[PDB]
Structure 1
Amino acid sequence: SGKRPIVANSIQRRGKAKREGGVGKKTTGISKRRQYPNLQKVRVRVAGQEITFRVAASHIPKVYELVERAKGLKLEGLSPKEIKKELL
């Protein structure tokens, strides 16, 4: 949907199998349909000033580490690029 640090979201398939297991008798497959795995997003408000990121919430922590950096710069309204960028 976005990603911030991390990155985007794949597009998985499917498996409708109706069968034994291969540990009794065979096991056939009903249908493959195109699924879409959205990237478990989630939002973060942070103190750098009054900032907001949309961390892939598996990296939420990275938000802070990135906050744990006093790059020495007053207002700019966003000051995210530096953050989200002078990042790594």
Structure 2
Amino acid sequence: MSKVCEISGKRPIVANSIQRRGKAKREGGVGKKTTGISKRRQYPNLQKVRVRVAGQEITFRVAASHIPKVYELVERAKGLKLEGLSPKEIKKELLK
């Protein structure tokens, strides 16, 4: 899709880069201040998982967190027919 996980649906979120000058008030620290707050994207740790399923090779773009979910989907094996677009089946219709 676009920098998203095919398995977890995890997609890049928006977070703030907060620069802080000061000693922590919990350290005799008159206070923490804030010099800047700007926008940044956090990107899911995406990786290629390339598996040979029954006929041909099948390539995923999964979050590294959900990698074994591929190999547990690799378990389900029946319907040894058409093209490398088997994931259509390996996908949600497995999990649904």
TM-score, length basis structure 1: 0.48
CA change 1:19–1:27 in 2 (3 A) is farther
Q: Distance in 2 between matches of 1:9 and 1:25?
A: 17
Displacement, 1:85?
2.2
In the aligned structure 2, how far is the partner of 1:8 from the partner of 1:23? 27
C-alpha contact 1:20 1:26 (8 A) present in aligned 2: no
Coordinate RMSD, CA, aligned: 6.9
Q: Identical aligned pairs, as a percentage?
A: 100
Pair 84,29 (structure 1): closer, same or farther in 2 beyond 3 Å: same
Offset, 1:77: 2.8
Could you list the runs of 4 or more consecutive aligned residues of structure 1 that deviate by over 3 angstroms after TM superposition? 1-48
The answer (yes or no) to whether the contact 2:20–2:35 under 8 Å persists in 1 is: no
Write 1 or 2 for the structure with the bigger share of strand: 2
Mean alpha-carbon deviation: is it higher for 52-61 or for 3-12? 3-12
1:72 CA displacement: 1.8
When residues 61 and 67 of structure 1 are mapped into structure 2, their CA distance, relative to the original with a 3 A threshold, is: same
Confirm or deny: 8 A CA contact 1:66 1:87 kept in the other structure: yes
| Worse overlay, 43-52 or 11-20 | 11-20
Deviation at 1:71, TM superposition (A): 2.9
Q: Is the 8 A contact 1:12 1:37 kept in 2?
A: no
- Pick which of 20-29 and 44-53 moved more: 20-29
Deviates more, 1:71-80 or 1:9-18: 9-18
Whether the aligned pair in 1 keeps the contact of 2:15 and 2:42 (CA below 8 Å) is: no
Gaps of 5+ in 2: 1-7
